[PDB]
């Protein structure tokens, strides 16, 4: 129930991995989705993969 401008995130480089599977880093702003879910945690470097 909101508008999200993902171009703010992808074009800010306060990020390391934009590992998007099923979508391209630049296309999220163009598409509409039913409901989005967010999860968060802190991990180590080599385990990111």
């Amino acid at each position: 129930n909101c508008v999200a401008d993902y171009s703010v995130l992808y074009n800010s480089a306060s990020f390391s991995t934009f590992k998007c599977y099923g979508v391209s880093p630049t296309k999220l702003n163009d598409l509409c989705f039913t409901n989005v879910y967010a999860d968060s945690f802190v991990i180590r470097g080599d385990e990111v993969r």
Partner: nanobody
Framework: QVQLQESGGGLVQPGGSLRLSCAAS????????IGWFRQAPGKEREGVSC????????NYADSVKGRFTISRDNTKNTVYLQMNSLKPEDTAVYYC????????????????????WGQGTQVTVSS
């Protein structure tokens, strides 16, 4: 499969020269802006120099201003850091990293987060 490899380091005499080659496999390095980084033993990671994805914008550090030169070969998927008039202060392991534009404006003199960190090569200057 996104790999960055640092090739071209070694032990050099002060006042000499050396060339570094950053190799990318599994992805297109042309779409990524590259910036070299150094972390000497006992020193924090300070920015060497940054070059944009198109190569038309270049960043440099005042500690190596006029001595370190950056060029990229997007056709060969490689970015080169040419070093001249070396000093013992440059004895550090060197990493090349890829990341996108962090803000408006073309130059990338402002540091930001870096995605792909390579294995790194240690370049030693001592004589």
């Amino acid at each position: 499969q996104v790999q960055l490899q640092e090739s071209g380091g070694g032990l050099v005499q002060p006042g000499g020269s050396l060339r570094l080659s950053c190799a990318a496999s599994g992805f297109t390095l042309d779409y990524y802006a590259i910036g070299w980084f150094r972390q000497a033993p006992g020193k924090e990671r300070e920015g060497v120099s940054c070059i944009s994805s198109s190569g038309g914008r270049t960043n440099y550090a005042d500690s190596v201003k006029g001595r370190f030169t950056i060029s990229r070969d997007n056709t060969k998927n490689t970015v080169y850091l040419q070093m001249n008039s070396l000093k013992p202060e440059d004895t550090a392991v060197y990493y090349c990293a890829a990341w996108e534009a962090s803000r408006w404006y073309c130059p990338l003199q402002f540091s930001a987060d870096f995605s792909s960190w390579g294995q790194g090569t240690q370049v030693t200057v001592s004589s």
